[PDB]
Design an enzyme around this catalytic site. Structure first.
Site, PDB file in Angstrom:
ATOM      1  N   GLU A 270       0.844  -1.194   0.000  1.00  0.00           N
ATOM      2  CA  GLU A 270       0.000   0.000   0.000  1.00  0.00           C
ATOM      3  C   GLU A 270       0.887   1.254   0.000  1.00  0.00           C
ATOM      4  O   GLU A 270       0.622   2.214  -0.727  1.00  0.00           O
ATOM      5  CB  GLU A 270      -0.945   0.059   1.214  1.00  0.00           C
ATOM      6  CG  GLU A 270      -1.439   1.499   1.466  1.00  0.00           C
ATOM      7  CD  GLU A 270      -2.532   1.633   2.490  1.00  0.00           C
ATOM      8  OE1 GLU A 270      -3.599   1.033   2.335  1.00  0.00           O
ATOM      9  OE2 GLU A 270      -2.386   2.408   3.451  1.00  0.00           O
TER      10      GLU A 270
ATOM     11  N   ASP B 116      -9.086   2.547   0.924  1.00  0.00           N
ATOM     12  CA  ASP B 116      -7.726   3.026   1.138  1.00  0.00           C
ATOM     13  C   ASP B 116      -7.550   4.411   0.544  1.00  0.00           C
ATOM     14  O   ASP B 116      -6.942   5.283   1.154  1.00  0.00           O
ATOM     15  CB  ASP B 116      -6.708   2.076   0.517  1.00  0.00           C
ATOM     16  CG  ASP B 116      -6.506   0.834   1.337  1.00  0.00           C
ATOM     17  OD1 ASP B 116      -6.454   0.941   2.571  1.00  0.00           O
ATOM     18  OD2 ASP B 116      -6.361  -0.258   0.776  1.00  0.00           O
TER      19      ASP B 116
ATOM     20  N   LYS C  78      -5.325  -4.662  -1.949  1.00  0.00           N
ATOM     21  CA  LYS C  78      -5.493  -5.983  -1.353  1.00  0.00           C
ATOM     22  C   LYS C  78      -4.344  -6.905  -1.738  1.00  0.00           C
ATOM     23  O   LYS C  78      -3.847  -6.858  -2.863  1.00  0.00           O
ATOM     24  CB  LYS C  78      -6.851  -6.579  -1.722  1.00  0.00           C
ATOM     25  CG  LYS C  78      -7.995  -5.735  -1.154  1.00  0.00           C
ATOM     26  CD  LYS C  78      -9.341  -6.399  -1.277  1.00  0.00           C
ATOM     27  CE  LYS C  78     -10.382  -5.662  -0.427  1.00  0.00           C
ATOM     28  NZ  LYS C  78     -10.128  -5.785   1.043  1.00  0.00           N
TER      29      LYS C  78
ATOM     30  N   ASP D  82      -8.975   0.378  -3.550  1.00  0.00           N
ATOM     31  CA  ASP D  82      -8.574  -0.385  -2.380  1.00  0.00           C
ATOM     32  C   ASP D  82      -7.445  -1.367  -2.693  1.00  0.00           C
ATOM     33  O   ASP D  82      -7.507  -2.124  -3.660  1.00  0.00           O
ATOM     34  CB  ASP D  82      -9.799  -1.130  -1.855  1.00  0.00           C
ATOM     35  CG  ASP D  82      -9.811  -1.270  -0.347  1.00  0.00           C
ATOM     36  OD1 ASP D  82     -10.088  -2.382   0.124  1.00  0.00           O
ATOM     37  OD2 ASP D  82      -9.593  -0.286   0.387  1.00  0.00           O
TER      38      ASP D  82
HETATM   39 CL   LIG Z   1      -6.106  -2.286   2.039  1.00  0.00          CL
HETATM   40 CL   LIG Z   2      -4.947   2.276   4.000  1.00  0.00          CL
END
Ligand SMILES: [Cl-]
Ligand SMILES: [Cl-]
Ligand SMILES: [Cl-]
Ligand SMILES: [Cl-]
Lengths: 234, 236
Positions: free
Chosen positions: B44, B73, B91, B89
């Site tokens: 991330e 996110d 993952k 997001d």
């Molecule tokens: Cl995440």
């Molecule tokens: Cl995050």
DNA sequence: AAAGATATCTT
DNA sequence: CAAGATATCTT
């Protein structure tokens, strides 16, 4: 001792260095996040070299889980005495009085081989290295700009304490059934100012704590537990 | 498009840089760990500057949650289109051997998908797209000491960008935390979007009425075929 | 507080 | 697979 040397080493390392980013093999640095999910991960990795170092000085082998659903972060033991292992687990929380989630109360403490690297009865100590940080970019950096990278914390404190000593009587989580620590100032964790009279009491309390209020309405706190004991565990 | 540029950028950065350690302000380097909790966090942080770059290039503002229990996110939106927000997001999941089947936990099915403002940065109905930047790494001593300005905690890493509804499956990704589960397939199926639902609407209806336990699902629907039968009969 | 979200994994 | 574990937060 291993214990005193470990916390002395953790304190010094915490005083001397400030983690500020993720570096790639090419030298590009990505700044960190200011949330616990990020910091908890970093704090553990920051502790790893120190734990292995001190353990080696005292003749202990260090093993990490091979599975992601296994406690503890680090298992220490002398090859001669395999039945006297030491569990060292890293926990983190933030401040702007604190509290920690001390692990599940329905896994290894209720089933000797459940979610644990080695059978629970092979461990003679369960230490918690707790990190408490005071909560505070979207660009990248190079090695010459380290000083420019915003640190995701205004301060960080670390302590080493036995799990039972800092345990409380209220769950730290619902669906994930975690033991809750005492809710106190950092000093109380260092000084070990808990509520349990012994580790035997801590274990029994959490091994018999019901998952929900309905069922608990048996015992919901230490006073009620002591009464439950008096009643003959019924 | 924002989307095409974003995947190209992610795919490129993935190929040209290998994350390998935590660095201190003093220049000391701490090796990484090989588990998902660590790597998902890293991936991330690795994605953040790329997302912001591409977004700005398209005039989108990027906003991250102000609290841990909020999806997504990254929320991207143009000031002119407040009700056309894009949720992106990150993952992650792993593979023991490269090219094996994989699965992702696609977020809860009892929070924002059932309650417009529950556990989400902005009301669910202000987002028109829900993208997932999926990372898959092959899981993999020197890693125990610190370094000066290091083994990598992964053998290889692949990345894809795809709509959440497109890669959604019909079996839960988690039990007590009630997560939507993705399809259980090879990386290419995620890239190609070979999911099971026919429309985003079917995806939403399925996960909005999926019961929490096998017991309950036993008398309603536990998979797509059963759901379609349930639908055919009149939702009874 | 108690209960359930925040992400992903394992038997 | 299901279910509940792996951590911590939010309310
Ligand atoms: Cl995440
Ligand atoms: Cl995050
Ligand atoms: Cl760990
Ligand atoms: Cl940990």
């Amino acid at each position: 001792s291993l214990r005193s040397d470990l916390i002395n080493a953790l304190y010094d390392e915490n005083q001397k260095y400030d983690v500020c980013g993720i570096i790639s093999a090419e030298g590009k640095i990505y700044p960190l996040g200011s949330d616990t999910k990020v910091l908890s991960t970093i704090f553990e990795l920051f502790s790893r070299p120190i734990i292995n170092k001190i353990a080696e000085k005292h003749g202990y082998i260090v093993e990490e889980p091979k599975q992601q659903n296994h406690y503890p972060d680090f298992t220490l033991y002398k090859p001669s005495e395999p039945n006297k292992k030491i569990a060292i687990d890293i926990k983190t929380t933030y401040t702007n009085k604190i509290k920690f989630t001390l692990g599940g109360y329905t896994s290894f403490i209720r089933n000797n081989t459940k979610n644990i690297v080695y059978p629970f009865d092979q461990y003679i100590a369960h230490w918690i290295i707790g990190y408490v940080y005071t909560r505070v970019s979207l660009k990248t950096y190079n090695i010459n700009e380290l000083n420019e990278i915003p640190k995701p914390y205004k301060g960080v404190k670390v302590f080493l304490q036995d799990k039972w000593v800092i345990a409380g009587d209220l769950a730290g989580s619902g669906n994930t059934t975690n033991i809750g620590s005492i809710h106190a100032h950092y000093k109380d964790f260092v000084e070990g100012k808990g509520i349990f009279d012994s580790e035997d009491e801590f274990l029994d309390y959490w091994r018999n704590y019901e998952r929900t209020s309905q069922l608990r309405n048996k015992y919901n706190n230490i006073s009620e537990y002591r009464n439950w004991i008096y009643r003959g565990r019924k």
